[PDB]
Amino acid sequence: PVLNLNDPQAVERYEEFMRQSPYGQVTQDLGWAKVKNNWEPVDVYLEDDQGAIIAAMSMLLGDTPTDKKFAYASKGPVMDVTDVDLLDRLVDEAVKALDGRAYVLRFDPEVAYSDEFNTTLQDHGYVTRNRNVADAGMHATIQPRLNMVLDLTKFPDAKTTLDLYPSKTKSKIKRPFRDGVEVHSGNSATELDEFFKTYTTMAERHGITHRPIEYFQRMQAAFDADTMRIFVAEREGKLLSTGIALKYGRKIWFMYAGSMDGNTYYAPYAVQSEMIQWALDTNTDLYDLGGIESESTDDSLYVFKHVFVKDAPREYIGEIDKVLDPEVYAELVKD
C-alpha cells in the first residue's frame, strides 16, 4: 500500500518498521523528506499475512529538464534486497504510486556488489549502474559505491576507540588529545553554529559550494539528540574542527565535517575518535566513515579514512534503475 502522510497512526507504524529494521537507513526515514523539503515524498510498503509491515520504500521525486520526474529512494528500500522476488513486489507498489509521473525509480541499497547479484537484477528487468559506469562526472552514481566501514562486531570486548587499533594508530589518535584538544557533543543550536562556521570555512578554503544552514536546521528539527549529534573539537578557547554523525539502524554514519584554516592540532582525528566512542557506547554494529573515490594513497580522503578503517572498502551493488520511460531514461541517463 501507499502511505498516507496525513494519517498519524499509519505514519507511526511506518516509522516503527523503519527504526526497528536491521535494514533501516536514515535516508529512508520519513524525517529525510523534511530535510529534502524541495523534493516530493511518496512512500509505499508491503504487509505479510498478519498485516505487519515487512518491507518499505521512501521515495523522493525531483524535477528534470523534461516533463518527467526523477524518483529516488536513497539507500533504500528497507528489506533484504537480495530477496529479489519480494523486491519486485515492493517495486510494483512503488511504480503504481508514482502513477506514471516519473521516468525512473532508482534505489541504491548498501548491499555488497557481486556478479551473481548484478546478473539476477538484470534478469529481472532492472538496469544496474556500478562497475559499468564512469567513476565521476554527472554520469557517475549519486552516492559513492566505495565506503570505508568499520565493523565493530569484530571487537566484542572493545571498551574505547583505542582498543580497535594497532599501536601505531593508537598513537595517531592520542596525539590531538595530548596536545590539548577537547571534544563536546550534542544537537543544540550553538553546536550547529559551531559546525557551520567550520563547514563553510572549509568550503571556502577548497573553493567549493556548501549547503545552507537551513538544511541542517531542518535536519536538527527532524531528528532528536539520540539520532543526530554534532561533535565539536576545541583547544584552549579556539574552534578547530567539527563533524556531524547520524545514528540509525545498525550504524552511525559520519556525514559532514568542517575544519578551520591553519593549525588544527589534528582535531579531525579527535572528532573521529569520539564518533567511534559513541558507536561503542551505544553498541552499534557499524561506524560508516563515508565514501572514497579511489582506494589509493593519491586520495587524501582515502588516506584519512584508511587511518580508521584498515579493512578493504565495502563495494556496493550501486544504482538499481526500474526504467519507466525508456526514451527519457536514455536522454537523461548514460554510462
**Whether 235 is catalytic:** no
Compute the least distance from the CB of residue 104 to Mg ion, in Å.
14
How many residues line the site for Mg ion (CB under 5 A)? 1
- Is residue 194 annotated as part of the catalytic site, yes or no? no
Nearer Cβ to Mg ion, position 99 or 123?
99
- Shortest distance, position 67 Cβ to Mg ion, whole Å: 6
Q: Environment class of residue 332 by beta-carbon count within 10 Å: exposed (0-12), middle (13-18) or buried (19+)?
A: middle
Q: Are 75 and 60 in contact (CB under 8 A)?
A: no
In the complex with Mg ion, the residue whose CB is nearer, 63 or 204, is 63
Does residue 4 have a known ligand-binding role? no
Q: How many Cβ atoms sit within 10 Å of the Cβ of residue 66?
A: 13
Residue 103 counted as an annotated binding residue: yes
Q: How far is the CB of 236 from Mg ion (least distance, A)?
A: 53
CB 45 within 8 A of CB 10: no
26: DSSP letter: G
Please say which residue, 63 or 193, places its beta carbon nearer to Mg ion: 63
Please, what is the minimum distance in Å from the beta carbon of residue 70 to Mg ion? Answer: 9
CA distances to 111, 291, 294, 298 from 315, rounded to whole Å, are 8, 10, 11, 19
**7-39 burial by CB neighbour count: b if 16+ within 10 A, else e?**
eeebeebbeebbeebebbbbbbbbbbbebbeeb
Choosing from 29, 43, 93, 108, which is the catalytic residue?
Answer: 108
Contact 31, 248 (CB under 8 A): no
Q: Does 36 show up as a binding residue in the annotation? A: yes
Q: Round to whole Å and give the CA distance between 326 and 322.
A: 10
Of residues 63 and 295, the one with the C-beta less far from Mg ion: 63
319 is catalytic: yes
Taking the complex as a whole, the smallest distance from the CB of residue 66 to Mg ion amounts, in Å, to 6
Q: Which of residues 39-78 bind Mg ion (CB under 5 A)?
A: 63
d(CA 276, CA 164): 10
Q: Is 39 annotated as a binding residue?
A: yes
Respond yes or no: is residue 108 known to be catalytic.
yes
CB-closest chain residue to Mg ion: 63
Annotated binding residue 211 = yes
Q: Are 251 and 309 in contact (CB under 8 A)?
A: no
Consult the annotation and say whether 147 binds a ligand: no
- Cite the active site residues: 36, 108, 211, 304-305, 319
Indicate the annotated binding residues for substrate: 36-39, 103, 211, 215, 256
Indicate the annotated binding residues: 36-39, 103, 211, 215, 256
Interface positions with Mg ion (CB under 5 A): 63
